[PDB]
Structures are given as structure tokens and as C-alpha cells.
Design a protein around this nucleic acid. Structure first.
Ligand code: FES
Ligand SMILES: [K+]
Ligand SMILES: [Mg+2]
Ligand SMILES: [Mg+2]
Ligand SMILES: [Mg+2]
Ligand SMILES: [Mg+2]
Ligand SMILES: [Mg+2]
Ligand SMILES: [Mg+2]
Ligand SMILES: [Mg+2]
Lengths: 91, 86, 97, 136, 137, 100
RNA sequence: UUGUUAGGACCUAAACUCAAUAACGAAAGUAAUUCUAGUCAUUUAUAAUACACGACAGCUAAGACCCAAACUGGGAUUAGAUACCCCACUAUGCUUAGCCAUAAACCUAAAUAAUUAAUUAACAAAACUAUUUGCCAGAGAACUACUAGCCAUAGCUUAAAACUCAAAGGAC
């Protein structure tokens, strides 16, 4: 993997994708509550998805970038993407 | 003593606001340095002591004014992150 | 060699040096109207060069003229003359309310 | 086993020494390439020091002869009301047209700067350029 | 068309009166605010004494004699004596920089006197007498 | 082939002379909330605030007018050996350029 | 006694702001105003047993005296308080003559002319070459003893040894 020498190739590979999505939406240019009663996946859940260990600052930055994605105009591809990182909340 | 009375250090009360006039007179005396001068004339400051205080206050004013410039200068870059995520 | 190489010269665009409001003017002890623009209206105290904005040479010239006028019977010591209260404000100081 | 001493010699010289010693048995892949196509300067460590006394740098102020004319134009008329476009590689500003005409007259043989400055203003006026002699 | 903080210039003619008197005619309230006792005296424009008071005369003693509330009581007492003598407007020349510098002016207002101006006459020598030596503590 | 010395002499930036109080045309390339990042052809971009009037007009790619002040904001401070730089230029946004 | 005085006298003493300035002078030192006198050229460094100076305190004689103040007295505090705090008042700080010649008299940096790279003991105040003089050679004994000179007499400059110790000292 081209990001091997970062030490967090999977965390930074994901932050590469979401930052590239954000750029295309901002360049290219409705209600954002497509999903309700949902939460962002907790740090323990994210670590499992990436199969690596993260810090608290690493988790916080990932969420801030994902929030920025929702703010921008989102095609169905973006909504499916952010969905993968949303866990259904049971009230 | 030989000057005219009620011209120097005199303020006029507006609409019976005697507290507002007193607050103005104090800022005038504080700004002209009379308050500090009267404070330090209660006891005698030795000439060597006076010189040490003035050299320290001058250097403190230089480094303070310079630190203000550095914060104001570096606060222009203080804005929302443009490269969030990288 | 090369015609387009730069040419040594003094900076054509060099900006002029800023002058004080009394640059190349005569400060006289008898001109109490000008001297009064650099003292305090209430106490009559001479302002420093951080308030007046004068250069060192003119700051000393005003200081000497004020002391000479005061000591010779031309300028009051303890206050600014009420006649000169209306003159233009040239000093970075505000006192009102 | 290596030479983690980056303040003595260079990466190439230290690799040359380690091979002579007998510790590094195989040449690195970048070695033969450096040997054939070295850099202009050897990459050796040097501690930056401040200049003291009357030592000065050796950097030439870049001033062309057009600047004498350009300085006058900005002092007399300021910057042209038309805005500079620094993205067009062949942009011709109002000031650059003034300096091109001022040069043309000087080639004819006019020796007085005052003559060249007032004549150039007239020529551009005929061209239709709006030159405002703004003292403000 | 605005109020002027600067006192009416003496010797000229002004449009400002207080109870039909000019600035030069209003009685003066001389407040000497020291660090121990705050004295107050009111005089007419001809320099004739009308009222007098101080924290000591009111009855305060020792450290109580030099508090803000002690000067306020002294000001109220000076006002009452002056108000009886026929004084409604006073020019407050406050000498001294003690604790009852402001409180003495506040007592005079509470006592029914109308202050039209406040002057300060704290002695500031221009070079004078050597002050006593610094206290070691 | 033109020489580097010729290219520099005939460069638009060399013609500009001093960059104080000059007028230039820029292009918006990046927007962060109401902050506009404008490239005016220099080394460093400037950052201005979206004007209240015609705010929606200032989108990416929009060419604008500017009044340059400095090409790079730098200043040595007391006790420093080098100038501190914020890697930014100084300009005042005047408004959109007329396409005409 | 106190407060006010646009009342009188006094010219004792000290010179706010300016001064956030960094000037003058060999140093000491010098900043209220005016006037008079006055700083200046030896290539440069290098001087004592000579000459002229030298803060403050102190001594001698005659004056001054607003305020400050050793000492002293009175009041508090404390186990005591010959102190710190309060009050009073001297020598003294001022002038005019003369003496005294000492300061952490310290930019703790001798002066002068170069250099800024072929250069981090630490800290301070970047490093370093050349020239001339002075000075230093473990610590204490010792700003001492003796000697000589001096308006100095409880003084200054000059300045050891015995003996004791295995350290003393500087920076971090
Ligand atoms: S700047 Fe020229 S006399 Fe002040
Ligand atoms: K010292
Ligand atoms: Mg006693
Ligand atoms: Mg006495
Ligand atoms: Mg000595
Ligand atoms: Mg000294
Ligand atoms: Mg001694
Ligand atoms: Mg001896
Ligand atoms: Mg002896």
C-alpha cells in the first residue's frame, strides 16, 4: 500500500478518500437528515473496521471530516458512504 | 499659588451627574501621571532605586508592546481550517 | 554578454521618509499658540514623544521653548490657556468623559 | 552496523567507508548511480553561522533601466485605472505602454527627460488612453 | 451647542448660571482627604467659612476615622450646616487622595447640596521637600 | 530561446514594480465559509472576507479586483534571527471584475 | 492645633511633566531658565617614584536651616527587642575656605587596529588574531603584623610569615 510508511495506512487511506470526495462536491457546486435516530460509530467500532488502533484525536478528526461531507451537496454515493459509518440506535 | 484658581484640573458636572464628573477627573489625573506621582511622593525613593525602576518599566513596556505585535501579527492566520482532513 | 541583465542603481521606487508635523519649522518660545498644542489642557504637563508624535530633535525643541516661555512670563505652567483650547488637536490623547 | 554520523562527511562517503572497512558487504542500489551522476555539490553537513562586523551577503538588487521611467509614472499618474492581469503572460499594462513609447522617443535622440515625459503623455492621449495626472 | 467640561473662563461673560449666580460666585466645598482623617469645609466666594466637619468631629475614632462611611457622614453633616446657612450649589475642590475622597463628595450630595464642578488641588511639588523615608515591612 | 534574464525583465511581476496600493485581477480557487482564497498571480494567495453585497456571486473561478499591499506578510521580532512569515499575501477585495 | 485665604513675607532647600529620551564629560559626575567663559587638530597603542582630579560618609572654621535624618528621648511589639512600626529632636545632608582619598569607584568588559571563516566547557556579553603595558600563580590566616609615604592620629595607600587545611572556588 502506498501509505505504508505513515504507520496508519488504513486510517490515512480512509481520510484520503473522504477528503477527495469533499473536494469534488465543493468544486461541483436540500435537507441533510436522510437518516434519523442514528449515531456515529464509536472509536472501538471504527478501529475494528480499519483493523488498526486509533487515538482519541484520530477518531475526532475522522468525524469532523465526515460531518463536513454531509454539510455539502451529497449524491446517493455519498449517502451510502456515510451510512457505512453510522450505527442504528435502539431507543 | 500665583496662577488662577478653578482653571487647572477642573471638571464641570453635567445634569447633576456628580459621579460621572468625578470618574472623568480621575481618568484625567491618572492619564497625566499625577496619581502615580502623588503615590510615590509619600515616601522617598532613593536615586539608585528610581533608576532601577525606570529601566525595568521601560524594558517591560518594550517587551509587552512587542509581544502585542507578535500576537496581532500571528492572529491573522487564525481562521477556520481550510484543509480539514489533511 | 546579456543585454537583459539587471543594472546596478539606487532604488528608483524608494519611499520618502516620514516627517514630523514640525519638520523644518521654527519653534519659538514666543509662539505660545503652537507650544500649547503639546501640553495637557487640565494639568499643563508636557506630553511625551509617544503622544505628540514628534521626532527627538523637535521634542527637545518644544520642551526647551515651553520651559523658556513659562519662565519668562509668556506661558502658564499649571494649565493650558483657555484661549488655545480651540486649536487643532495633533496629539494621540483623549480625555472627554 | 552502520554510520549514523550525519555531521561528518556525506551519505556517499560514509557508504564508501563502510564498504572499505568490511561491514557493508553489498553495495546499495543507489551507489553506482551516485558514482556515475553525482550532484554538483557534495552533501556534507555545515553549521549555519551569523555574519558579524562588516561581512555582508552578495545579492544584487534587480533594477532595470525601465524602472527609472516607471517610478516617475507611478508618482505622476499612479497605477493605471485598468487592473493588472498577472495571469496573462503577454499582458501590456498602461505603465508598460508608457515605457515603450518613452523608449521610442529616446531612440530618436531626445536628451531631455522632461521632453520625453510630456511628449509620451501626448502620444498616449492620441492613442486614447485615459491618463489622469493625480497629485492626490 | 454642547456641554463643556472646561470651567467657564474667568473674566469673560458666560450664559451659565446656577440659582442666579455665576460660576465665580458659587460657594466652594474644600475637602482634604488624607489617609487618616477626611476634613470638609465650605466657604463663600469671598472666603468666609460657612460649614465645617470631619470624621473626628462626627465622633469616629482611630482607624474608623479614616473609612469611606466615616467621610460620608462628615459630608452629610457639612451639608446640613451649610444648607441652614443658605447654600444650594457648591464647587468641590477636593485636595488629598485618601479613602474618603469620593465618599465626602457623596455625603454632600446626599445632604441636599448640588455640586456643579469638581476641582483637584492635591499638592504636587515640582522638584520641593524630601519625603520621609520608606517604611520597612 | 529566450533567456531567464529576458523572461524576468519582461515579466508582468517585474512591470508591476512595488506591490503597495496596486490594482490586480485575482481568481477565487478555494472558499471556506465566508473566507475567499484568491490567486492574483503571485507566490502567495490572499484571504479576504465575502462582501455583504452580491455575496452569492463570489463563487469558485470568479475573477475579482484587488488592491495589493504586500506580496508576503513577514516581520522580524525582537530577538529573532529570521523574519517570521505567515505564508500569506495582503490585499483588499474591491469587487467582481466586469466580464464585458 | 486644625481647615480656608484669587492675604503678606521668605528666596532656605530641591528642580514634576518633558524622560517611552540615551546626550555631555577622563572618571567621579551632570537634565528649572538665561547670559558669559569653555570642550577642537599630538599617526596610534603603551607611564610612575611626578602632576591634576576623584560619589557618599567624615574632620576643621564661619554661616544657613524648608524638609529629611545617624544618635538620643518618649510610645508600642516581644520570653527579651539595645530592632523592624509610631512621635519628637540632634550630628549631618546646604553655602563659603581647607582637609580626607575611600565605594559592588562594577559594562564585575585595559586600550588600539583587524577579521566573521578557513569557531559552541557552562553561563553571561558570539568567536578570535595582532600590538603595548598592568596584573595573577591552592584556600584560610589577611582590606592582618611589620616597613615607608601621607594636613590623614580609632585613618588611607604599600603588604608578609609562622601556623591550619585537602581542599577552597566557578557553572550547570
Ligand atoms: S522629522 Fe524632521 S525635524 Fe522632525
Ligand atoms: K555594576
Ligand atoms: Mg526607644
Ligand atoms: Mg539640624
Ligand atoms: Mg581601592
Ligand atoms: Mg558609578
Ligand atoms: Mg578598606
Ligand atoms: Mg591596615
Ligand atoms: Mg601598617
Amino acid at each position: 500500500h502506498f501509505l505504508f510508511y505513515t504507520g496508519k495506512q488504513s486510517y490515512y487511506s480512509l481520510m484520503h478518500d473522504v477528503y477527495g470526495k469533499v473536494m469534488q462536491l465543493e468544486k461541483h457546486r436540500a435537507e441533510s437528515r436522510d437518516l434519523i435516530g442514528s449515531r456515529w460509530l464509536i472509536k472501538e467500532e471504527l478501529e475494528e473496521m480499519l483493523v488498526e488502533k486509533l487515538s482519541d484525536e484520530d477518531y475526532a478528526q475522522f468525524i469532523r471530516l465526515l460531518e463536513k461531507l454531509l454539510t455539502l451537496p451529497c449524491g446517493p454515493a455519498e449517502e451510502e458512504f456515510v451510512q457505512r459509518f453510522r450505527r442504528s440506535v435502539t431507543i | 499659588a500665583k496662577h488662577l484658581k478653578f482653571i487647572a484640573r477642573t471638571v464641570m458636572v453635567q445634569e447633576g451627574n456628580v459621579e460621572g464628573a468625578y470618574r472623568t477627573l480621575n481618568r484625567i489625573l491618572t492619564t497625566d501621571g499625577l496619581t502615580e506621582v502623588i503615590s510615590r511622593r509619600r515616601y522617598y525613593e532613593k536615586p539608585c532605586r528610581r533608576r532601577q525602576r525606570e529601566s525595568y518599566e521601560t524594558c517591560r513596556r518594550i517587551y509587552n508592546m512587542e509581544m502585542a505585535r507578535k500576537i496581532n501579527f500571528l492572529m491573522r492566520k487564525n481562521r477556520a481550517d481550510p484543509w480539514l482532513g489533511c | 554578454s546579456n543585454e537583459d541583465l539587471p543594472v546596478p542603481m539606487e532604488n528608483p521606487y524608494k519611499e520618502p521618509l516620514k516627517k514630523c508635523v514640525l519638520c523644518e519649522k521654527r519653534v519659538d518660545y514666543k509662539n505660545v499658540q503652537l507650544l500649547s498644542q503639546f501640553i495637557s489642557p487640565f494639568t499643563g504637563c508636557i506630553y511625551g514623544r509617544h503622544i505628540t508624535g514628534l521626532c527627538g530633535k523637535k521634542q527637545r525643541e518644544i520642551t526647551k521653548a515651553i520651559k523658556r516661555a513659562q519662565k519668562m512670563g509668556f506661558m502658564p505652567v499649571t494649565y493650558k490657556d483657555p484661549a488655545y483650547l480651540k486649536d487643532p488637536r495633533v496629539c494621540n490623547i483623549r480625555y472627554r468623559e | 552496523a552502520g554510520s549514523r554520523l550525519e555531521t561528518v562527511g556525506s551519505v556517499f562517503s560514509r557508504t564508501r567507508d563502510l564498504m572499505r572497512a568490511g561491514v557493508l558487504k553489498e553495495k546499495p542500489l543507489w551507489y553506482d548511480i551516485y558514482k556515475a551522476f553525482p550532484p554538483l555539490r557534495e552533501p556534507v553537513f555545515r553549521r549555519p553561522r551569523l555574519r558579524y562586523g562588516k561581512a555582508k551577503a552578495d545579492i544584487q538588487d534587480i533594477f532595470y533601466q525601465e524602472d527609472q521611467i516607471r517610478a516617475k509614472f507611478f508618482a505622476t499618474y499612479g497605477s493605471g485605472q485598468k487592473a493588472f492581469d498577472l495571469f496573462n503572460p503577454n499582458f501590456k499594462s498602461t505603465c508598460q505602454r508608457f515605457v515603450e513609447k518613452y523608449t521610442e522617443l529616446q531612440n530618436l535622440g531626445e536628451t531631455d527627460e522632461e521632453k520625453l515625459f510630456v511628449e509620451t503623455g501626448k502620444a498616449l492621449l492620441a492613442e486614447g488612453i485615459i491618463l489622469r495626472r493625480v497629485r492626490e | 451647542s454642547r456641554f463643556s467640561l472646561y470651567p467657564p473662563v474667568p473674566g469673560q461673560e458666560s450664559s451659565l448660571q446656577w440659582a442666579g449666580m455665576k460660576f465665580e460666585d458659587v460657594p466652594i466645598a474644600h475637602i482634604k482627604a488624607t489617609y487618616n482623617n477626611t476634613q470638609i469645609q465650605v466657604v463663600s466666594a469671598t472666603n468666609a467659612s460657612l460649614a465645617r466637619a470631619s470624621c473626628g468631629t462626627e465622633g469616629f475614632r482611630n482607624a474608623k476615622k479614616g473609612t469611606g462611611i466615616a467621610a460620608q457622614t462628615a459630608g452629610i453633616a457639612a451639608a446640613a450646616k451649610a444648607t441652614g446657612k443658605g447654600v444650594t450649589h457648591i464647587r468641590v475642590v477636593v485636595k488629598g487622595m485618601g479613602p474618603g475622597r469620593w465618599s465626602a463628595i457623596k455625603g454632600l450630595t446626599m445632604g441636599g447640596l448640588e455640586v456643579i464642578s469638581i476641582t483637584d488641588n492635591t499638592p504636587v511639588p515640582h522638584x520641593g521637600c524630601r519625603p520621609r523615608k520608606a517604611r520597612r515591612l | 530561446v529566450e533567456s531567464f534574464a529576458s523572461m524576468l525583465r519582461h515579466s508582468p511581476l517585474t512591470q508591476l514594480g512595488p506591490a503597495k496600493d496596486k490594482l490586480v485581477i485575482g481568481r477565487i480557487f478555494h472558499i471556506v465559509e465566508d473566507d475567499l482564497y484568491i490567486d492574483f498571480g503571485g507566490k502567495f494567495h490572499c484571504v479576504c472576507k465575502r462582501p455583504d453585497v452580491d455575496g452569492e456571486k463570489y463563487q469558485r473561478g470568479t475573477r475579482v479586483r484587488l488592491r495589493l499591499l504586500d506580496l508576503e506578510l513577514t516581520s522580524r521580532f525582537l530577538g529573532g534571527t529570521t523574519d517570521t512569515t505567515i505564508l500569506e499575501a495582503d490585499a483588499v477585495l474591491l469587487g467582481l471584475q466586469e466580464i464585458r
